[PDB]
Amino acid sequence: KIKY
Amino acid sequence: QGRPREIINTYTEAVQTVDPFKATGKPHTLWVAFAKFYEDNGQLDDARVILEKATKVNFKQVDDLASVWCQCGELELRHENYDEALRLLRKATALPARRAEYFDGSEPVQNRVYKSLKVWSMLADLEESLGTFQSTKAVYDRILDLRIATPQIVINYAMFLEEHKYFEESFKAYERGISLFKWPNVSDIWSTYLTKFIARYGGRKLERARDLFEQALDGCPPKYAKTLYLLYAQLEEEWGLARHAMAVYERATRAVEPAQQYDMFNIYIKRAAEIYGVTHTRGIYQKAIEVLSDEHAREMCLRFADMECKLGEIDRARAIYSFCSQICDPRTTGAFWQTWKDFEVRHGNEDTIKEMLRIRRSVQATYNTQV
Amino acid sequence: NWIKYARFEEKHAYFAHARKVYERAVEFFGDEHMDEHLYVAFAKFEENQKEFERVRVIYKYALDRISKQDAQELFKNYTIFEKKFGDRRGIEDIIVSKRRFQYEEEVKANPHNYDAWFDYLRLVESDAEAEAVREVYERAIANVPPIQEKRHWKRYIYLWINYALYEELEAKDPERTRQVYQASLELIP
Amino acid sequence: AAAQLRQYHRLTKQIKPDMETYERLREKHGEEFFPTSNSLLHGTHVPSTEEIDRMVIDLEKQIEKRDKYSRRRPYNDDADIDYINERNAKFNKKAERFYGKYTAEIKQNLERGTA
Numbered sequence: 184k185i186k187y
Numbered sequence: 188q189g190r191p192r193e194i195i196n197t198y199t200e201a202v203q204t205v206d207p208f209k210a211t212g213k214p215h216t217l218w219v220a221f222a223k224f225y226e227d228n229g230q231l232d233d234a235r236v237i238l239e240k241a242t243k244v245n246f247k248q249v250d251d252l253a254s255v256w257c258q259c260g261e262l263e264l265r266h267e268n269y270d271e272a273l274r275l276l277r278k279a280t281a282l283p284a285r286r287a288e289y290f291d292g293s294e295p296v297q298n299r300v301y302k303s304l305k306v307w308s309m310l311a312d313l314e315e316s317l318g319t320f321q322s323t324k325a326v327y328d329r330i331l332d333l334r335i336a337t338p339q340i341v342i343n344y345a346m347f348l349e350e351h352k353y354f355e356e357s358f359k360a361y362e363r364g365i366s367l368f369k370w371p372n373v374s375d376i377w378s379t380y381l382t383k384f385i386a387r388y389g390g391r392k393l394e395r396a397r398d399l400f401e402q403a404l405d406g407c408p409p410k411y412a413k414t415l416y417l418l419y420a421q422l423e424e425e426w427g428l429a430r431h432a433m434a435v436y437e438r439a440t441r442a443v444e445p446a447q448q449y450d451m452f453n454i455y456i457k458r459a460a461e462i463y464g465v466t467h468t469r470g471i472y473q474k475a476i477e478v479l480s481d482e483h484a485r486e487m488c489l490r491f492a493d494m495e496c497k498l499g500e501i502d503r504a505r506a507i508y509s510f511c512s513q514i515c516d517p518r519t520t521g522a523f524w525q526t527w528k529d530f531e532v533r534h535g536n537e538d539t540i541k542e543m544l545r546i547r548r549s550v551q552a553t554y555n556t557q558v
Numbered sequence: 559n560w561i562k563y564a565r566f567e568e569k570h571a572y573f574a575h576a577r578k579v580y581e582r583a584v585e586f587f588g589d590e591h592m593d594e595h596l597y598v599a600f601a602k603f604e605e606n607q608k609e610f611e612r613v614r615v616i617y618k619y620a621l622d623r624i625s626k627q628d629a630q631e632l633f634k635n636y637t638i639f640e641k642k643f644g645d646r647r648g649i650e651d652i653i654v655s656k657r658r659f660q661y662e663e664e665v666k667a668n669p670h671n672y673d674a675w676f677d678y679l680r681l682v683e684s685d686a687e688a689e690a691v692r693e694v695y696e697r698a699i700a701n702v703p704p705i706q707e708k709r710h711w712k713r714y715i716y717l718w719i720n721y722a723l724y725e726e727l728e729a730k731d732p733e734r735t736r737q738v739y740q741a742s743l744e745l746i747p
Numbered sequence: 748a749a750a751q752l753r754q755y756h757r758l759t760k761q762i763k764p765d766m767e768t769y770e771r772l773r774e775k776h777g778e779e780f781f782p783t784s785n786s787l788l789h790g791t792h793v794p795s796t797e798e799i800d801r802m803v804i805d806l807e808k809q810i811e812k813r814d815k816y817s818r819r820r821p822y823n824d825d826a827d828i829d830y831i832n833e834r835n836a837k838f839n840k841k842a843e844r845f846y847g848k849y850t851a852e853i854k855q856n857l858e859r860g861t862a
Contacts, residue, residue: 184801185800186805187801187802187805258589353647354646354647354648355645355646355647358642358646358651359646361642362642362643364645389648392679394656394660394680395652395655395656398655398660399638399655401636401639428676430672430673430676431673431677434673561750562750563749565752565753566753569753695838738781
């Protein structure tokens with residue numbers, strides 16, 4: 184959730 | 188070479204083929220012919236070993252297997268007494284019941300209707316000569332197809348009617364005919380068997396017969412040419428009710444001629460001619476003039492126009508002529524204008540009132556002639 | 559979505575979770591009536607597995623549907639499909655064939671002319687004892703005297719024929735025939 | 748209306764919804780036009796990261812120039828399908844016109860005349  | 192006999196030896200070379208490769212049906216047909224050469228070899232000697240050796244090829248997935256077993260069943264029909272032929276044909280016919288087809292190959296489905304129904308038909312319920320068909324043998328054939336089959340649907344329903352002759356076989360034939368093939372392919376035979384079975388089983392002039400017959404065929408495509416009516420319309424008119432016959436005549440008139448044929452038009456105009464009366468012929472004249480293809484509204488409006496002018500007043504003849512001006516493209520014609528003018532002259536016009544009819548008809552023809 | 563999951567699960571073999579998911583999904587989605595929702599899945603799994611208990615339970619749950627049995631032709635064609643498949647023939651399936659949608663549509667015709675009363679009498683030929691025949695004859699007798707001259711005379715013959723068949727059904731010239739003679743006094747012209 | 752099923756056959760479509768409809772039928776015709784692949788061998792290339800939708804690595808090595816050409820083929824196929832709109836369908840009749848705008852005004856005038 185911290186990238187996409 | 189030396190086929191019937193030479194040394195009574197080379198027949199084995201005739202049965203000798205080998206060379207294993209990809210083939211379908213050739214080793215089975217040549218193996219059945221080799222089983223006939225075995226029939227000239229002393230019959231049952233070496234025949235059962237050939238049938239058992241050629242009976243198992245891979246696992247199912249072939250139409251040649253059951254065709255060779257069914258061929259052995261035909262040779263068993265050539266065997267005279269049906270005791271042993273019925274035992275061996277009963278076990279060999281009962282073997283595909285456990286497993287049929289669709290293991291590996293180029294066939295997407297099993298397709299056990301043809302071969303399996305052929306072996307089950309050869310075992311029992313041949314509908315020709317051989318007997319020994321149990322009351323459950325028809326359900327054994329319908330279960331042999333296991334989904335739907337209708338090459339024999341007429342003969343299968345005829346066999347179920349021979350063993351039973353009740354409404355259960357008629358409803359099962361209607362469901363097997365509907366699920367058999369879409370559209371009135373086997374459903375038309377289900378409709379014929381529905382009318383004949385409706386008369387000979389469900390009773391004459393039955394409401395449930397018309398409810399089912401009108402329910403299955405309700406929307407329908409146009410059958411062979413077309414029938415939406417004559418079976419149910421004639422059956423309703425012959426049932427003794429003059430009320431529902433007219434309702435079935437109008438509802439049958441809506442679906443009458445999807446192809447715009449004059450047949451159904453004359454059948455509706457004749458149905459309204461033999462019943463009701465004048466006003467019904469006028470309503471059929473307006474309805475016939477409403478539906479138009481090419482010559483339909485012109486011919487129907489002309490016939491009903493002359494029939495109305497010969498009976499009623501001349502108002503429907505003049506208005507029917509004005510309606511004949513907007514329809515019936517000029518082409519050649521010329522007879523309807525002179526016949527309508529003469530009919531107007533016979534109505535008491537003569538000098539007066541005919542100047543606008545002849546001048547308006549010629550002015551309408553010249554206006555339709557363009558330049 | 560239930561038909562799609564039932565089709566994919568149908569091609570997936572199994573069908574235990576497809577039937578349990580069909581009943582569970584049909585139970586959670588129930589609001590007013592099932593109609594094309596549960597009955598289509600009940601007929602799909604029914605005819606797929608060839609189970610008479612599921613067809614009888616589906617026919618029982620379909621009879622409890624409100625809003626005039628939900629969709630008329632849907633439940634009628636489905637009940638005729640499972641009917642014709644399972645048993646059909648005569649007796650039960652014949653009386654139910656005259657009953658259900660046929661007896662409801664012929665039951666309430668919104669009476670206007672004598673044809674609807676003649677259809678209600680045709681469906682009332684074999685129904686119950688003479689009480690229902692007398693109720694249909696008395697209900698259709700005063701239903702349509704449309705006029706003095708012409709028509710109603712044939713409607714008066716329809717009331718005299720309904721009272722003659724209803725009164726002559728269980729007896730021969732009973733007191734109901736004398737009452738039919740009192741109604742034959744022509745209160746019309 | 749109809750949600751989904753397993754089958755392939757002819758249809759009608761070609762209607763007003765346009766973009767959404769042409770993209771749905773184009774993706775369905777593209778997916779049905781391209782069958783399955785060697786992904787079983789990619790089933791050897793499969794290991795432990797497959798599921799768990801939210802992705803730890805969304806790039807990796809891609810595949811090769813193979814998948815580049817195999818990706819370029821449906822682009823040229825969509826270019827050829829996009830090159831199909833209408834035909835010339837011309838003739839000498841009635842009166843003359845001026846370039847395109849008069850022909851478009853003739854089509855719109857014919858659409859307004861028939862109502």
